[PDB]
Structure formats: C-alpha cells, structure tokens
C-alpha cells in the first residue's frame, strides 16, 4: 500500500524526532535513536527502488522500535537518578539493540518476537517511572511502585528463561498496576480536603493492594479482573476530583 | 497457543474497564457487550474450531476493545460538551459499522475501517482529556476546540474515501491535543513560578505555529515542529512536577 506506507513513515519520523529530543545527551539513548533513524532510511530506500512488501515489513518493524525508544527515553528522563530504573533502561536498551541487529541480519521472525517483548517492557518501565514521580513523597505509594518494579525485574529474567507468554503477561500486569498508582496518586492530589473523595481514593487504593497480592498469589484471571476494575474506578474518581473545584 | 492466551487476557481487561467506564450509558454498553460477544466467539472458535481463524478474529476484537475503551474514556471526560458528545457518538457509529463489516465477512475492509476508528477513538479521548486539563483557560480551550474541528474534518474526509489524508489528520489531531494536555498540566504544576511559566508560554507559541503550519498545508514541517513541541512540553511538565 503506497499511501499507507507514507503514513506509517510519517508517524515513525515523528516518534524518532521526539525520542531524539527526549534523549538529550544520553549516549545509549542517542545511539538507539540514531540506529533506528538509519533503519527508517533503509525502509524508505527499499520502498524507493525495491519491493514494497519488504519495505512495509521493514517499516512496521522500525515503527515498533521507535515506539519503544520513545517510551525508554521518557522513562530515563522521569527516573532521574533512581538506580533501579537506570539499570532497567539499560537492559531494555540492550535488548532493543539486539532486536535490531537480529532483524538486520535477516532472521526477522525471531527479532519481531524480541521486539514485541522490548516494546511492552519499554511501556512498563515508562509508566513505572512516571508513577514514581507522581507518588512523590508518599511511602505507601512508593512501596507499591517498589513491588511493581520488582515484578518488572522478574519478567525480564523470565523471558530470558524461555517462558515468553508468562513474562509478557507479567509486563501487562506491571503496566496496568503502575498506571493505577499514577491515577491514584493523581486522584489524591485532585481531591483535596474533600473527605468523600479521599475515602473513595483510599478504598480504590486498597483494591489495588488486593489485586497486586492476588497476582503475586498466582490466581491471574481474578487479579487481572480486579486491576481492570481498579483502573476504571481510579480514572472515574480522578476525573470527579478534577471537577469539584 | 501462548500468544492467544495473552491476547485474550489483554482484550478481557480492556473490555472489563470499558464496562465500568460505560456505566449506565446504553449506547456505550451496547458497544461493549457487542465486542465482548465477539471475544467469546473467538475463544469458542479456538476451543471448538480452527485456531487460525480464532486468532485473526481475536486480533480484531482486541483492536475493537482498545477503541471502545478510548471512546468510553472520552465520553466520561466530555461531560456535557455538545461538540465532544457528537464526535463520540459519530465514532461509536463508525465502530459499529466496522464490527458489522467483520461479522458479515469482508474482513479486510473491516480491518482497514477498524484501524481508522481506533485512531479517531484515540484522538477524541485526548481532545477530551486536554479540554479538562485546559480548565477555564480560554486560550487553551480555543485551541482544543480548534483541534476538534480538525478531528471532524478527518472523519468526513475518510467517509469520502481519501483515507490516508484523513489518517494523517487524526495523527496531527492526536499529537496536537496531546501537546495541549501536556502544556496545560505543566502550567497547573508550575504554579506562579516565573521561569516555568515563561517556558510553558514558549512551548504554547510553538504549538500554535505548528497548528498554523499544518493548516497552511505544509505537513512535513508541521509534523517536525509538533514532534519537537511534544518532547519540549514533556520535559517542562516533568521539571514542574518535580517542583510541586
């Protein structure tokens, strides 16, 4: 599709420009962005003279990577000097560069699989990092982000051991749970002195603690249902607090 | 299959959160229940039929669930604003046609329709969020409702068959409404801080220029300026949040 290709490359170039600005002076980040910008050029040349279908796959792959380096650049900014998050970023960066190298050397299905995981991990570390920021000085919210980060550490080691689906599922849990923490920390600031809104936020927070613990206990169907509900309720209460003033 | 179980797990969460965000709205609940139905059939076909058809059917359901989650979010954030309500119902309508196209059989046309609907669903939710973060700011509310007009232009361009021009326009809508949201959140976090306020003002002026350039038809340059603005809005929203 010649007009669809132009559209996907437009998005890829936006993500790449933004990632490069977000990456600032970080060498690993700048290197990944530069590597991916070069890969977009290779998809465009392939489009300009070669096989449109090969360019399309090349380009769809560049798009996933650019999404991932965008998320990793955001995490690295938000994380500042937190050593655990910096260790995570560096690991995701390592995996993404290996994804690209594997893709360049022609085994595209195995690198596309790797890239899927990298993107989820990059989304996970970005919302964890943003949740740390929003939790501010609140120890209960910090303690929860600390657990959720540890679950993220486990997912990467789990993937390296070959249980891809379990690790991916664990990234999915990590992304939603740290997103709820962000929402809940936002809600408790948007509620102020209002005692109804504070109580409503506390109850939801208790539902997150329950869902995190169910997941750690291994009943995943129930824990995922609780998390999805928490997210909707945290959203609804954050919206309601925003509107009372 | 390992991928299929993880895909149904993601679709389930999106469907579960969309039900709660639907509340008692019947049009949104109709949409949720309808996508939940297709998820079950997908899982019934993986259970008692061909697994290859179930996974193409599940990947469609999963995009539908992301879309319906976005629109239900947007419907909540719209409150009683008549432009946004109207946009939401228009995307709900388009989403229903897409599902109905897939349920009949033209799966490739369902998928290209659904790809578009998911973008409009994303764009209308960020407009909605940005309108809330805009609060009582008249400058920001103008821009947001400006961006929503761009959004309405896209849906009709697409309904006329110029599919890729319209996709480019939603893309612009989403990054621009997103940038407004970031600038608004950063202004709220900065309080009265002299420098942070000046820095937010600078970014707003570059966002208006990007919008202006896009309206002139210089897409390549507007996309560059917008991608730049979004990174700069984000860095400044972080330094502000790291203050208060």
Author numbering:
A (entry chain B): 0 to 244
B (entry chain A): 1 to 244
Which lines from the publication concern this structure?
To investigate the photophysics of special pairs independently of the complexities of native photosynthetic proteins, and as a first step toward creating synthetic photosystems for new energy conversion technologies, we designed C2-symmetric proteins that hold two chlorophyll molecules in closely juxtaposed arrangements. For Chl dimer protein scaffolds, we chose hyperstable C2-symmetric repeat protein dimers containing symmetric pockets with tunable sizes and geometries. In this dimeric repeat protein architecture, the hydrophobic core is independent of the small molecule-binding site, enabling full customization for binding with little impact on the overall protein structure. We describe de novo-designed proteins that hold Chl dimers in precisely defined, closely juxtaposed geometries.
SP2 was intended to assemble a ZnPPaM dimer with a conformation substantially different from that of native special pairs to investigate the effect of dimer geometry. The SP2 crystal structure was solved in both the apo state and the ZnPPaM-bound state to 2.4 and 2.5 Å resolution, respectively. The apo- and holo-state amino acid backbones both agree with the SP2 design model to within 1.4 Å r.m.s.d. The holo-state crystal structure has two copies of the SP2 dimer in the asymmetric unit; alignment of the two ZnPPaM dimers shows that their binding geometries are equivalent, with an r.m.s.d of 0.22 Å over the tetrapyrrole rings. Despite the accuracy of the protein backbone design, the crystal structure shows that the ZnPPaM molecules are rotated and translated relative to the design model (3.5 Å r.m.s.d. across tetrapyrrole ring atoms). Compared with the apo-state crystal structure, the SP2 binding cavity widens by ~1.6 Å in the presence of ZnPPaM; this expansion provides the extra volume needed for the ZnPPaM molecules to adopt their unexpected conformation. While the ZnPPaM dimer in SP2 differs from the design model, the crystal structure nevertheless satisfies the objective of creating a non-native dimer geometry. Using the SP2−ZnPPaM dimer crystal structure, we calculated an excitonic coupling energy of 241 cm−1. The experimental SP2−ZnPPaM absorption features at 668 and 690 nm correspond to a Qy peak splitting of 477 cm−1 (a coupling of 239 cm−1), which is consistent with the calculated value. The close agreement between the calculated and experimental data supports the conclusion that the SP2−ZnPPaM dimer system exhibits excitonic delocalization.
